[PDB]
Design a protein around this motif. Structure first.
Motif, PDB file in Angstrom:
ATOM      1  N   UNK A 176       0.799  -1.217   0.000  1.00  0.00           N
ATOM      2  CA  UNK A 176       0.000   0.000   0.000  1.00  0.00           C
ATOM      3  C   UNK A 176       0.844   1.284   0.000  1.00  0.00           C
ATOM      4  N   UNK A 177       2.021   1.226   0.618  1.00  0.00           N
ATOM      5  CA  UNK A 177       2.876   2.397   0.800  1.00  0.00           C
ATOM      6  C   UNK A 177       3.274   3.077  -0.506  1.00  0.00           C
ATOM      7  N   UNK A 178       3.340   2.307  -1.585  1.00  0.00           N
ATOM      8  CA  UNK A 178       3.627   2.865  -2.899  1.00  0.00           C
ATOM      9  C   UNK A 178       2.577   3.888  -3.285  1.00  0.00           C
ATOM     10  N   UNK A 179       1.325   3.581  -2.976  1.00  0.00           N
ATOM     11  CA  UNK A 179       0.216   4.400  -3.422  1.00  0.00           C
ATOM     12  C   UNK A 179      -0.006   5.575  -2.487  1.00  0.00           C
ATOM     13  N   UNK A 180       0.225   5.373  -1.201  1.00  0.00           N
ATOM     14  CA  UNK A 180       0.119   6.479  -0.264  1.00  0.00           C
ATOM     15  C   UNK A 180       1.183   7.528  -0.588  1.00  0.00           C
ATOM     16  N   UNK A 181       2.385   7.065  -0.914  1.00  0.00           N
ATOM     17  CA  UNK A 181       3.484   7.963  -1.229  1.00  0.00           C
ATOM     18  C   UNK A 181       3.110   8.826  -2.424  1.00  0.00           C
ATOM     19  N   UNK A 182       2.648   8.159  -3.471  1.00  0.00           N
ATOM     20  CA  UNK A 182       2.154   8.832  -4.659  1.00  0.00           C
ATOM     21  C   UNK A 182       1.131   9.922  -4.313  1.00  0.00           C
ATOM     22  N   UNK A 183       0.163   9.577  -3.477  1.00  0.00           N
ATOM     23  CA  UNK A 183      -0.846  10.543  -3.075  1.00  0.00           C
ATOM     24  C   UNK A 183      -0.205  11.689  -2.284  1.00  0.00           C
ATOM     25  N   UNK A 184       0.673  11.348  -1.342  1.00  0.00           N
ATOM     26  CA  UNK A 184       1.361  12.351  -0.528  1.00  0.00           C
ATOM     27  C   UNK A 184       2.196  13.292  -1.388  1.00  0.00           C
ATOM     28  N   UNK A 185       2.883  12.724  -2.369  1.00  0.00           N
ATOM     29  CA  UNK A 185       3.744  13.491  -3.255  1.00  0.00           C
ATOM     30  C   UNK A 185       2.942  14.484  -4.089  1.00  0.00           C
ATOM     31  N   UNK A 186       1.725  14.081  -4.442  1.00  0.00           N
ATOM     32  CA  UNK A 186       0.849  14.903  -5.251  1.00  0.00           C
ATOM     33  C   UNK A 186       0.043  15.841  -4.360  1.00  0.00           C
ATOM     34  N   UNK A 187       0.080  15.593  -3.059  1.00  0.00           N
ATOM     35  CA  UNK A 187      -0.665  16.403  -2.119  1.00  0.00           C
ATOM     36  C   UNK A 187      -2.160  16.154  -2.195  1.00  0.00           C
ATOM     37  N   UNK A 188      -2.558  14.964  -2.645  1.00  0.00           N
ATOM     38  CA  UNK A 188      -3.971  14.630  -2.657  1.00  0.00           C
ATOM     39  C   UNK A 188      -4.226  13.607  -1.560  1.00  0.00           C
ATOM     40  N   UNK A 189      -5.480  13.512  -1.108  1.00  0.00           N
ATOM     41  CA  UNK A 189      -5.770  12.583  -0.017  1.00  0.00           C
ATOM     42  C   UNK A 189      -5.676  11.143  -0.484  1.00  0.00           C
ATOM     43  N   UNK A 190      -5.356  10.238   0.436  1.00  0.00           N
ATOM     44  CA  UNK A 190      -5.409   8.809   0.156  1.00  0.00           C
ATOM     45  C   UNK A 190      -6.389   8.142   1.116  1.00  0.00           C
ATOM     46  N   UNK A 191      -7.397   7.475   0.574  1.00  0.00           N
ATOM     47  CA  UNK A 191      -8.334   6.742   1.409  1.00  0.00           C
ATOM     48  C   UNK A 191      -8.234   5.258   1.108  1.00  0.00           C
ATOM     49  N   UNK A 192      -8.644   4.430   2.067  1.00  0.00           N
ATOM     50  CA  UNK A 192      -8.688   2.990   1.872  1.00  0.00           C
ATOM     51  C   UNK A 192     -10.117   2.472   1.941  1.00  0.00           C
ATOM     52  N   UNK A 193     -10.488   1.655   0.965  1.00  0.00           N
ATOM     53  CA  UNK A 193     -11.754   0.939   1.022  1.00  0.00           C
ATOM     54  C   UNK A 193     -11.404  -0.475   1.442  1.00  0.00           C
ATOM     55  N   UNK A 194     -11.708  -0.797   2.688  1.00  0.00           N
ATOM     56  CA  UNK A 194     -11.347  -2.086   3.247  1.00  0.00           C
ATOM     57  C   UNK A 194     -12.516  -3.047   3.143  1.00  0.00           C
ATOM     58  N   UNK A 195     -12.378  -4.041   2.277  1.00  0.00           N
ATOM     59  CA  UNK A 195     -13.446  -5.012   2.076  1.00  0.00           C
ATOM     60  C   UNK A 195     -13.395  -6.120   3.131  1.00  0.00           C
ATOM     61  N   UNK A 196     -14.512  -6.293   3.835  1.00  0.00           N
ATOM     62  CA  UNK A 196     -14.606  -7.191   4.995  1.00  0.00           C
ATOM     63  C   UNK A 196     -14.602  -8.690   4.725  1.00  0.00           C
ATOM     64  N   UNK A 197     -14.871  -9.100   3.493  1.00  0.00           N
ATOM     65  CA  UNK A 197     -14.975 -10.534   3.191  1.00  0.00           C
ATOM     66  C   UNK A 197     -13.859 -11.377   3.805  1.00  0.00           C
ATOM     67  N   UNK A 198     -14.243 -12.414   4.545  1.00  0.00           N
ATOM     68  CA  UNK A 198     -13.290 -13.386   5.061  1.00  0.00           C
ATOM     69  C   UNK A 198     -12.839 -14.298   3.929  1.00  0.00           C
ATOM     70  N   UNK A 199     -11.803 -15.077   4.187  1.00  0.00           N
ATOM     71  CA  UNK A 199     -11.306 -16.024   3.190  1.00  0.00           C
ATOM     72  C   UNK A 199     -12.400 -16.994   2.738  1.00  0.00           C
ATOM     73  N   UNK A 200     -13.219 -17.488   3.663  1.00  0.00           N
ATOM     74  CA  UNK A 200     -14.264 -18.450   3.287  1.00  0.00           C
ATOM     75  C   UNK A 200     -15.381 -17.775   2.501  1.00  0.00           C
ATOM     76  N   UNK A 201     -15.707 -16.530   2.849  1.00  0.00           N
ATOM     77  CA  UNK A 201     -16.657 -15.745   2.065  1.00  0.00           C
ATOM     78  C   UNK A 201     -16.125 -15.495   0.653  1.00  0.00           C
ATOM     79  N   UNK A 202     -14.840 -15.172   0.542  1.00  0.00           N
ATOM     80  CA  UNK A 202     -14.227 -14.955  -0.765  1.00  0.00           C
ATOM     81  C   UNK A 202     -14.236 -16.232  -1.608  1.00  0.00           C
TER      82      UNK A 202
END
Ligand SMILES: [Mg+2]
Length: 375
Positions: free
Chosen positions: A284-310
């Motif tokens: 993830x750090x690659x993308x946060x850095x990119x966002x930080x470098x551009x000065x735009x916000x970085x948000x995470x969409x965390x999908x809850x699915x467990x391994x068995x649900x997936x």
């Protein structure tokens, strides 16, 4: 003078001479239920390596037959679909077994993964809809008997190993059939301890919020980078396509490429969604850095699915969506070993949780979705 064998896509059917359609059924798995190896080895030395499991079996089958139960076998034989067991060899074995059992049987054989493979109910549906002359079958007056019953280790002397699978018990659960093991059924042994899978598909609805917290917004009017996190096969791409890409978000998928690309979109005033697994902090750090470098916000969409649900979802899409790319178990467990939950400390402005929900499917597909699909 038997109707004989019918060969369909991913299903074989044998109807012995003397079979009659009935409004109640007594159905059985084959291996480990009606027969076992004569060699005493866990797996058969050859097609000839079988005997009737218990001497009590034919008597019970005669009684059932005289009481008006149609006798049926539902057997998984994926060896056939994998090309490890010739269909023509297996058909001979079934006929020999049926001779020895000495009563008329109708046999359904699931040669492949998918809709017909227990615990999925494809074989029941075929029996009811295609192979019972249109007589409705009362599930409550029927019974399924099978050895893949999810039993724990030691349910009997010499049974120091748990059932390889719960596929037979779950098949009965899916259909609504009363269930029993071979020993409970033929031998009148007390019920054995068993487990069911932790993820129960019947308890998955289309209700609830799309994401949390509900006060948040899926979209930003300004440039930003959204990092999607969750198991493959969980439905992230579908969610992302439907809610962000349709809103003009740029779709990044590192596999087909990653930073400079993300940066190029931001300079153009665009918003970016990183649609990958992104299981850990370095990913993830690659993308946060990119966002930080551009000065735009970085948000995470965390999908809850467990391994068995997936994995459930993956199997469901394998059965229903011609364009679904099958996610291998290799990829699932590899993701799970790498997974570190997202935290704000990583540099995310906020994290949205995306609860795992039932998609928007037709009535039949919703019924399929609520079936256990793996033993
Ligand atoms: Mg079995």
């Amino acid at each position: 003078s038997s109707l004989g064998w019918e060969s369909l896509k991913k299903l074989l059917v044998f109807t012995a001479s003397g079979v009659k359609p009935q409004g109640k059924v007594a159905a059985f798995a084959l291996d480990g239920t009606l027969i076992t190896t004569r060699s005493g080895k866990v797996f058969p030395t050859s097609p000839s390596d079988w005997r009737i499991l218990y001497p009590e079996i034919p008597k019970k089958l005669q009684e059932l037959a005289a009481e008006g139960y149609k006798l049926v076998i539902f057997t998984n034989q994926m060896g056939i679909g994998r090309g490890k067991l010739p269909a023509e060899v297996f058909k001979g074995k079934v006929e020999a077994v049926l001779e020895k059992l000495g009563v008329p049987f109708q046999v359904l054989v699931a040669t492949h993964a998918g809709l017909n493979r227990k615990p999925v109910s494809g074989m029941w549906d075929h029996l009811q809809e295609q192979a019972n002359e249109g007589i409705p079958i009362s599930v409550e007056d029927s019974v399924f008997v099978g050895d893949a019953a999810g039993r724990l280790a030691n349910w009997a002397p010499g049974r120091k190993k748990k059932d390889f699978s719960c596929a037979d018990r779950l098949f009965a659960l899916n259909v609504g059939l009363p269930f029993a093991t071979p020993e409970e059924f033929f031998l009148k042994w007390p019920a054995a301890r068993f487990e069911l899978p932790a993820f129960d598909p019947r308890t998955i609805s289309s209700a609830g919020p799309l994401y949390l917290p509900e006060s948040s917004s899926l979209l930003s009017p300004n440039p930003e980078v959204v990092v999607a996190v969750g198991f493959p096969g969980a439905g992230k791409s579908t969610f992302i396509q439907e809610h962000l890409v349709s809103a003009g978000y740029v779709h990044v998928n590192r596999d087909t490429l990653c930073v400079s690309s993300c940066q190029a979109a931001l300079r153009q005033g665009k918003r970016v969604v990183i649609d990958n697994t992104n299981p850990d902090v370095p990913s993830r750090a690659r993308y946060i850095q990119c966002a930080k470098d551009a000065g735009v916000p970085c948000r995470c969409f965390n999908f809850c699915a467990t391994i068995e649900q997936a994995r459930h979802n993956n199997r469901f899409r394998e059965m229903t969506d011609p364009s679904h790319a099958p996610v291998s178990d290799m990829v699932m467990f590899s993701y799970r070993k790498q997974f570190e939950p997202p935290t704000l400390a990583e540099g995310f402005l906020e994290i949205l949780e995306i609860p795992f929900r039932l998609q928007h499917l037709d009535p039949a597909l919703q019924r399929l979705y609520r079936q256990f699909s793996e033993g």
